[PDB]
Symmetry: D2
Subunit: 68 residues, 4 copies
C-alpha cells in the first residue's frame, strides 16, 4: 500500500496531537495553580504580619499605659 | 498626638495592602489570560495545519489517482 | 457551481468555528476572573473582620484594665 | 484565666481561617480546571468533526468524480 498507508500516517499524527495538547493544557493549568498559591501565601503572610504589628502598637499604647 | 498617630499609620498601610494586592491579583489573572490565548492560538493553528495537510493527502490520493 | 460551493461552505464554517471558540474562551476566562475577585474580596473581608476582633480583645484586655 | 483565653480563642480562630481559605482556593482552582478541560474537549471534538467532514466533501467530490 502507499496512499492508504499515507492515510494511516495522518490518523496517527492527529491522535498524537490531541494527546500532546491535552498534556500541554494540563501544564498550563498546573503552572497557574502554582503561581496562584504562591501569591496567595505571600498576600496572606503579609496580611498576617500586619496583624502581628497592629498588636504591638495597641500593645505599647496600653501596655506602657501603666507607667503613664 | 503620638500613639493615635501610630494608629493612623497602620490604618493607612492596611488600606494600602488591599489596593496593592487587589492589583497584583489582576496581574496574575491577565498573565494567565495571555498564556491562555497563546496556547489556544498555537494548539489551534496546529489543528488547522493538520486540516490543511490532510487536504493534499486525500487530494493527491485521488487527484493524481485520476491519471492512474 | 457545485463542489466549489460545498468547498467554500466549509472554509466559511471553519473561519466561523474559530471566531466562536475564540470568544467562548474569553467567556470562560472572564467567568474565572469574577469568581476570583469574589473569593478574594470575601477571604479578605474576613481576614479584615478578624483584624477588628483581635483589636477589641487586646483592647478590653487592657482598655478597662485601668479599673483592674 | 480569661483574656489569655480569649487570646487563645482568636489565635486558634485565625489559624483556622487560613485552613478554610487555603482549601476554598483549591476548590476554586479545581472548579476552573474542570470547566477548562470541558471546553477544551468540546472545542476539540468540533474541530475534529470538521475534519471528518472536510473529508467526505473532498471525498465524494472526487470519489464520485470517477463516474463523472
Amino acid at each position: 500500500a502507499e496512499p492508504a498507508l499515507r492515510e494511516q500516517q495522518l490518523q496517527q499524527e492527529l491522535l498524537a496531537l490531541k494527546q500532546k495538547q491535552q498534556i500541554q493544557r494540563q501544564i498550563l493549568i498546573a503552572e497557574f495553580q502554582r503561581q496562584f498559591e504562591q501569591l496567595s501565601r505571600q498576600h496572606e503572610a503579609q496580611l498576617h504580619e500586619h496583624i502581628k504589628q497592629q498588636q504591638e502598637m495597641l500593645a505599647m499604647k496600653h501596655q506602657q499605659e501603666l507607667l503613664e
